Write a structure and sequence with these properties.
Number of domains: 2
Number of strands: 20
CATH superfamily of the largest domain: Alkaline Phosphatase, subunit A
Keywords: Cell membrane, Glycoprotein, Hydrolase, Lipid metabolism, Membrane, Metal-binding, Signal, Transmembrane, Transmembrane helix, Zinc
Subcellular location: Cell membrane
CATH architecture of the largest domain: 3-Layer(aba) Sandwich
Radius of gyration: 21 Å
Distance between the termini: 15 Å
Helix content: 25-40%
Shape: globular
GO molecular function: phosphoric diester hydrolase activity; sphingomyelin phosphodiesterase activity; zinc ion binding
Binding site for substrate: 67
EC number: 3.1.4.12
Largest sheet: 8 strands, mixed
Structural class: alpha/beta
Oligomer: monomer
Bound molecules: a molecule of 3 linked components (NAG-NAG-BMA), a molecule of 3 linked components (NAG-NAG-FUC), a molecule of 2 linked components (NAG-NAG), 2-acetamido-2-deoxy-beta-D-glucopyranose, phosphocholine, sodium ion, zinc ion
């Protein structure tokens, strides 16, 4: 059987390669498969979208509905890195691909991949690595070292599956913006890594035995600070934080709210028209096309703002030049899907598809029984050769 290596570069917008010299990605497009663009799951956050890739489920169904673990009763809200170690957040009734594969005789590994450093129903990933709290995500030398480790897992630890995560170009896109020269420099670094990745596959005699997927979780868009009609809760006349028992704001264009007992209607009628670029819903009325709201963890009130606008709560504390989390229909949020290997055709470009379908493909590539999921294998099966 063929091994599988899934690689994710966080926040790689579908067209980041169009205004950058990317020789190695162009070559991989010649040698393998490429989607015009891939539509991510909503919300377009790092952890929810990554867990979709390894479960084949929409976010409302696998339960990881936010980068931050939160608990409305206790008021705890843990940042992204801390949440990577909260077992109950990820082990909420869905089984990621590492565990499914290991229950069927395979050995799987996770390198910095979200959700890959916790147990699921008592089962641990065969090999797992998690970065430090102050990790540097753009050290190219450290990238090559991690790839060396991954190759050792395949060859010397007899692993059949590995999911490898990189935190760029997301970090750079946030700080400098997705249209900046810094981002393009980071995409050039990504492209040099793609080459090194394929170079390492060949050195280890795995070219004809290992399938490679290079994808990402979401895109990136510019946050214009010049704009004057900012979404600021502290300037809503009829709203008051005295009516709120729990809040999750100041986190991009997505907000959650739990009003105090009996004040839901008061809070809602005030916010439904507070700003023409903030869309506030009761949990039951949130559009179903997002496949996000129907989960017990979601609060009675949730909201999202228009492209290029973040949500400011009690006071403005956000300063990123680029952001994500917006409607997954927006082109700036679309991301990439690239693949090459013995199972994959060559020179093929397919029309766009939702990331919910990657899981079914990976299970077919591994030859394992998939968990029930929201995807359909027929979507991506045209990517693969016909067996004889
Ligand atoms: C989450 O990731 C951490 C790594 O950041 C995992 O911890 C690592 O676990 C492995 C296996 O238990 C340890 O490797 C062992 O090291 C000892 C001593 O070097 C050696 O005798 C063994 O042969 C093996 O190589 C590794 O030291 C350890 N590192 C740290 C920093 O904890 C952890 O297992 C992961 N957790 C889950 C739930 O996946
Ligand atoms: C960029 O990263 C390299 C690599 O760091 C080493 O390998 C990583 C995978 C990590 O797991 C650690 O084991 C190591 O720190 C750094 O290069 C090392 O730097 C130290 C000095 O701090 C030196 O003693 C080592 O010999 C170096 N190793 C190599 C292979 O060059 C480098 O310092 C980092 N640079 C920045 C700016 O972050
Ligand atoms: C969310 O937070 C609440 C508040 O602390 C937790 O409720 C407590 O749960 C423990 C055991 O889990 C009980 O012994 C306490 O009596 C509970 N306290 C209250 C005030 O209800 C709850 O367990 C947390 N849930 C998660 C998933 O972390
Ligand atoms: C998934 O997580 C949710 C919440 O984190 C769990 O729901 C809680 O379930 C307990 C009892 O089972 C209730 O007392 C809490 O009020 C529930 N909280 C919420 C927010 O619904 C749920 O049990 C978890 N499911 C699995 C399969 O782990
Ligand atoms: C706030 O509520 C008062 C009370 O009805 C109303 O007169 C006013 O128009 C409201 N303002 C906004 C911006 O909704
Ligand atoms: C760690 N990281 C910043 C590179 C990526 C994940 O963080 P986030 O911006 O998606 O919340
Ligand atoms: Na290019
Ligand atoms: Zn991300
Ligand atoms: Zn981000």
């Amino acid at each position: 059987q063929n091994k599988l290596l899934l690689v994710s570069f966080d926040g790689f917008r579908w067209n980041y390669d169009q205004d950058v010299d990317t020789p190695n990605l162009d070559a991989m497009a010649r040698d393998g498969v490429k989607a015009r663009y891939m539509t991510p799951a909503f919300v377009t956050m790092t952890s929810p979208c990554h867990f979709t890739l390894v479960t084949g489920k929409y976010i409302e169904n696998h339960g990881v509905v936010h980068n931050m673990y939160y608990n409305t009763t206790s008021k705890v809200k843990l940042p992204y890195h801390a949440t990577l170690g909260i077992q109950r957040w990820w082990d909420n009734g869905s089984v990621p691909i590492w565990i499914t594969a290991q229950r069927q005789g395979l050995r799987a590994g996770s390198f910095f991949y979200p959700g890959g450093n916790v147990t699921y129903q008592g089962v641990a990933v065969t090999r797992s690595r998690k970065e430090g709290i102050a990790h540097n995500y753009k050290n190219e030398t450290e990238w090559r070292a991690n790839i060396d480790t991954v190759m050792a897992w395949f060859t010397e630890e007899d692993l059949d599956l590995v999911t490898l995560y990189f935190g760029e170009p997301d970090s750079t896109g946030h700080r400098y913006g997705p249209e900046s020269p810094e981002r393009r420099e980071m995409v050039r670094q990504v492209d040099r890594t793609v080459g090194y990745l394929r170079e390492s596959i060949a050195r280890n005699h795995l070219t004809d035995r290992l399938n490679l997927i290079i994808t990402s979780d979401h895109g990136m868009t510019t946050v214009d600070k010049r704009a004057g009609d900012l979404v600021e809760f502290h300037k809503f006349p009829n709203f008051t934080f005295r009516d709120i028992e729990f809040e999750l704001l100041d986190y991009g264009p997505n907000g959650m709210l739990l009003p105090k007992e009996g004040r839901l209607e008061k809070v809602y009628d005030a916010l439904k028209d507070a700003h023409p670029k903030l869309h506030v819903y009761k949990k039951e009325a949130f559009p179903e096309a997002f496949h996000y709201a129907n989960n017990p963890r979601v609060t009675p009130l949730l909201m999202y703002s228009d492209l290029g606008y973040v949500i400011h709560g009690r006071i403005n504390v956000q300063f990123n030049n680029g952001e994500h989390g917006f409607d997954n229909k927006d082109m700036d949020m679309k991301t990439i899907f690239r693949a090459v290997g013995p199972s994959f055709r060559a020179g093929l470009e397919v029309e766009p598809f939702e990331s919910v379908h990657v899981y079914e493909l990976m299970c077919r590539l591994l030859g394992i029984v998939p968990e029930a999921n929201d995807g359909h294998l027929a979507t991506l099966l045209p990517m693969l050769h016909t067996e004889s």
